[PDB]
Design a binder for this molecule. Structure first.
Ligand SMILES: [Cl-]
Ligand SMILES: [Cl-]
Ligand SMILES: [Cl-]
Ligand SMILES: [Cl-]
Ligand SMILES: [K+]
Ligand SMILES: [Mg+2]
Ligand SMILES: [Mg+2]
Ligand SMILES: [Mg+2]
Ligand SMILES: [Mg+2]
Ligand SMILES: [Mg+2]
Ligand SMILES: [Mg+2]
Ligand SMILES: [Mg+2]
Ligand SMILES: [Mg+2]
Ligand SMILES: [Mg+2]
Ligand SMILES: [Mg+2]
Ligand SMILES: [Mg+2]
Ligand SMILES: [Mg+2]
Ligand SMILES: [Mg+2]
Ligand SMILES: [Mg+2]
Ligand SMILES: [Mg+2]
Ligand SMILES: [Mg+2]
Ligand SMILES: [Mg+2]
Ligand code: NA
Ligand code: NA
Ligand code: NA
Ligand code: NA
Ligand code: NA
Ligand code: NA
Ligand code: NA
Ligand code: NA
Ligand SMILES: [Sr+2]
Ligand SMILES: [Sr+2]
Ligand SMILES: [Sr+2]
Ligand SMILES: [Sr+2]
Ligand SMILES: [Sr+2]
Ligand SMILES: [Sr+2]
Ligand SMILES: [Sr+2]
Ligand SMILES: [Sr+2]
Ligand SMILES: [Sr+2]
Ligand SMILES: [Sr+2]
Ligand SMILES: [Sr+2]
Ligand SMILES: [Sr+2]
Ligand SMILES: [Sr+2]
Ligand SMILES: [Sr+2]
Ligand SMILES: [Sr+2]
Lengths: 92, 194, 237, 56
RNA sequence: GCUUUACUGCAGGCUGUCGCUGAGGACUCUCACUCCGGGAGGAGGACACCGAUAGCCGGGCA
RNA sequence: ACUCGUACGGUCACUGAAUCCUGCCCAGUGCAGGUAUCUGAACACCUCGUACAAGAGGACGAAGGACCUGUCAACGGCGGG
RNA sequence: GAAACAUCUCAGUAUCGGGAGGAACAGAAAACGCAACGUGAUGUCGUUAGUAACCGCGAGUGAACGCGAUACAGCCCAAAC
């Protein structure tokens, strides 16, 4: 589906309507320093490693919308509940 | 002023530098052709020996013992084993080589008791340790105020029971506080979780 | 599964061993200090149980009696020599340096003084090709050109008993008798004729190997069977 | 030939005999080892914890 | 019990790297180390072996 | 252990006396060889980061793989129209 | 056991090797950390507590400091000279 790159909508920060910019959430890079990373190093030894021996599952036929709504004035962002969309293209 | 002993000590802080380096490269050649346990007239490290309780006296013996380097020499499982227990390569023994050395020495001298031991280097495939042993039956020692404690019946085979300094160290008894919950008063009394 | 036959072999049990106690002599080149001065007389010719070929009994000047790996044409009474300045005649042993090129040699040493390693079976021989101050090149019975230390001792002539392979065993009994004199388990049951549990090629409702026969060099014992690291197979192409 | 009765008739070999050390007829005269006390195998007397229930 | 391109692992083989290990991207050398030689001595040589780790193969085995 | 053995050997497999013979196929799988380029771990090295460290990236790149070739008395195949 | 099962659990259990005593082991702080102007070798008993902590964060696993008691004990070398 088509979607406007910018449009007027409620800004939860300003508490008033403002022009927001829609952006697809880019994955942040991992540090490898979180607790789970330490547990993987610790709990991995001879033989099977339990959860650390599993390999990530498949995919759902269609993913939900993963967007960031950025307020034009205050410059802050907010998230919303996404919706199933095969393709999401921005207009402008 | 400095003791002559302090110089032997300082030399051994870096067995790969200076005269000691040359010395080791020379001795090890002779050590590699010697046996498993070799009695020697004088300690290679006087400062260490004396520091550990050694004395130039009757009933005090020293022997150099060589043990193989590396992890456990383990035989792979011959019956069902869960993946955790199927290992062979990465398994290491719980006693350190110095402790193995002490025991091999004590067995060579059934009548003597292990007083202490120290490292004297290693090549690419083995380590050497010199063990100081004591004759608990010689009156020269039965009358020595500093060593006659080893003559007590309860000190019999002290090495096989881990009463040696290296033994106690390896048993995780160094710390008197945090971390020694499962080690003191004994590994066995603590369910073997040390 | 169970360990395959190739694995039982390595255990060195009676069934797999050679009847050493029935073997005669470890035919090695006699040791000489230097100067070459050493000769002996062929006292007899005997059968060697370990090699199915003749062997010469030789008595030396110093009184030493030893069996020797006999080349062809050696008989009782003949005088054999061993040393740097030995005569270039069949039966004599001298370093590859003193041996003239183009001459057939047998029982060649791999490392000077080892007593002989190459070309020792019936009828075979190595060809001495090139000389040098550093290396003597020899062509072993397999056809391989072997660069060797010119100080490596060797005997002149082809090993006795040549042509043994020309006559067929004809019947199992004959094989049986030969096999009984070697360190080998015989007869041979085909892997493909066994149960899956006994060999990688075992199993199936009909006899045929499971997977292809060419096995990687890296294969572990118990699996390394069939055509070991074959660079090719068949006859065509 | 049956592994039963017919194969029993060849059994005229002596193996286990009275042991010089323990008195039990378990000294294997071919192996020269007592299956009961370990005489011929060890200076120490043969004994195992599995010879009784774990709680005893 | 058996099989395999089932899941997960473990031996084993190959390979890099660190240690043993030294002198003057390819090379020379000898002194550790290895082998041959009764020996004198010869070949080999900082490699190989061995200890450690990493990648690959791996129903040989669990 | 083989081995008091050394390629006319001995190991590993297949076929199964003699006689007449044993075609075609290397695409897949196996094995083996080669390989410009691509891919390929760890140590060491470089950048960023941290008064250090965790960590992120880079450079180099072994066996292996891609790719190329050899091979069916290797596993096997030898049809529809 | 986890209602399968691989980490986990059964369990450092069963069993195995070595060795001492009448008891063993431990033990006079490179301790503790109710953070203090505080405690003062070590075992053990009660408690702290199924608490903290661990864990396909599943099933399960699981201390310590302290406190109340028991009994109390403190010393010897190496080196300097
Ligand atoms: Cl999206
Ligand atoms: Cl002792
Ligand atoms: Cl044959
Ligand atoms: Cl307190
Ligand atoms: K289990
Ligand atoms: Mg206790
Ligand atoms: Mg011979
Ligand atoms: Mg033939
Ligand atoms: Mg036989
Ligand atoms: Mg057959
Ligand atoms: Mg059958
Ligand atoms: Mg059947
Ligand atoms: Mg099989
Ligand atoms: Mg058939
Ligand atoms: Mg067939
Ligand atoms: Mg040798
Ligand atoms: Mg299986
Ligand atoms: Mg048939
Ligand atoms: Mg269950
Ligand atoms: Mg569950
Ligand atoms: Mg537990
Ligand atoms: Mg605490
Ligand atoms: Na852990
Ligand atoms: Na002793
Ligand atoms: Na522990
Ligand atoms: Na079954
Ligand atoms: Na093909
Ligand atoms: Na269940
Ligand atoms: Na089950
Ligand atoms: Na777990
Ligand atoms: Sr761990
Ligand atoms: Sr693992
Ligand atoms: Sr799907
Ligand atoms: Sr004793
Ligand atoms: Sr020989
Ligand atoms: Sr010899
Ligand atoms: Sr089959
Ligand atoms: Sr053909
Ligand atoms: Sr029968
Ligand atoms: Sr009988
Ligand atoms: Sr015995
Ligand atoms: Sr027992
Ligand atoms: Sr035929
Ligand atoms: Sr092919
Ligand atoms: Sr007190």
């Amino acid at each position: 589906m088509q979607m406007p790159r910018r449009f007027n909508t409620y800004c939860p920060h300003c508490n008033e309507h403002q022009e927001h910019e829609v952006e697809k959430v880019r994955s942040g890079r991992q540090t490898g320093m979180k607790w789970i990373d330490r547990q993987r190093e610790r709990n991995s030894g001879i033989g099977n490693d339990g959860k650390f021996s599993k390999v990530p599952g498949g995919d759902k036929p269609t993913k939900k919308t993963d967007l960031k709504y950025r307020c034009g004035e205050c410059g802050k962002a907010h998230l919303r509940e996404g919706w199933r969309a095969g393709r999401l293209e921005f207009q402008e | 002023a400095r003791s002559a002993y302090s110089y032997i000590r300082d030399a051994w802080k870096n067995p790969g530098d200076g005269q000691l380096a040359e010395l080791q490269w020379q001795r090890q050649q002779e050590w590699r052709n010697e046996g498993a346990v070799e009695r020697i007239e004088r300690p290679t490290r006087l400062d260490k020996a004396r520091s550990q309780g050694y004395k130039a006296k009757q009933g005090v013996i020293v022997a150099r013992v060589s043990v193989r380097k590396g992890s456990a020499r383990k035989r792979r499982h011959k019956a069902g084993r869960r993946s955790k227990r199927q290992g062979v390569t990465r398994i290491t023994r719980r006693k350190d080589i110095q402790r193995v050395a002490e025991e091999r020495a004590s067995r060579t001298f059934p009548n003597l008791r292990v007083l202490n031991s120290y490292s004297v280097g290693q090549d690419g495939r083995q380590k050497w340790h010199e063990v100081i042993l004591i004759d608990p039956n010689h009156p020269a020692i039965q009358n020595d105020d500093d060593l006659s404690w080893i003559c007590a019946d309860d000190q019999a085979d002290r090495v096989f029971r881990g009463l040696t300094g290296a033994g106690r160290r390896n048993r995780g008894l160094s710390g008197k506080g945090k971390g020694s919950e499962k080690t003191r008063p004994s590994l066995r009394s603590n369910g073997g979780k040390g | 599964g169970r360990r395959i036959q190739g694995q039982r072999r390595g255990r060195g049990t009676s069934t797999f061993r050679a009847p050493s106690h029935r073997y005669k002599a470890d035919l090695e080149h006699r040791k000489v200090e230097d100067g070459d001065v050493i000769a002996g007389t062929v006292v007899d010719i005997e059968h060697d149980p370990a090699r199915s070929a003749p062997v010469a009994a030789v008595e030396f000047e110093d009184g030493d009696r030893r069996l020797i790996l006999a080349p062809e044409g050696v008989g009782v009474g003949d005088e054999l020599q061993v040393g740097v300045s030995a005569e270039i005649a069949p039966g004599n042993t001298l370093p590859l340096a003193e041996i003239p090129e183009g001459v057939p040699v047998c029982n060649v040493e791999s490392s000077p003084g080892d007593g002989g390693k190459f070309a020792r079976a019936s009828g075979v021989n190595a060809q001495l090709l090139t000389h040098d101050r550093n290396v003597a090149v020899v062509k072993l019975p397999s056809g391989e050109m072997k660069r060797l230390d010119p100080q490596c001792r060797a005997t002149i002539g082809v090993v006795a008993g040549g042509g043994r392979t020309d006559k067929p065993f004809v019947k199992a009994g004959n094989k049986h008798h030969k096999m009984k004199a070697r360190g080998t388990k015989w007869p041979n049951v085909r892997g493909v004729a066994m149960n899956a549990v006994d060999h990688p090629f075992g199993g199936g409702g009909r006899q045929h190997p499971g997977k292809p026969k060419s096995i990687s060099r890296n294969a572990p014992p118990g699996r390394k069977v069939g055509d070991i690291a074959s660079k090719r197979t068949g006859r065509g192409g | 030939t049956g592994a039963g009765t017919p194969s029993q008739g060849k059994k005229n070999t002596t193996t286990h005999t009275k042991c010089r050390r323990c008195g039990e007829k378990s000294y294997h005269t071919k192996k020269k080892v007592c299956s009961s006390c370990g005489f011929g195998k060890s200076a120490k007397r043969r004994d195992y914890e599995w010879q009784s229930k774990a709680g005893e």
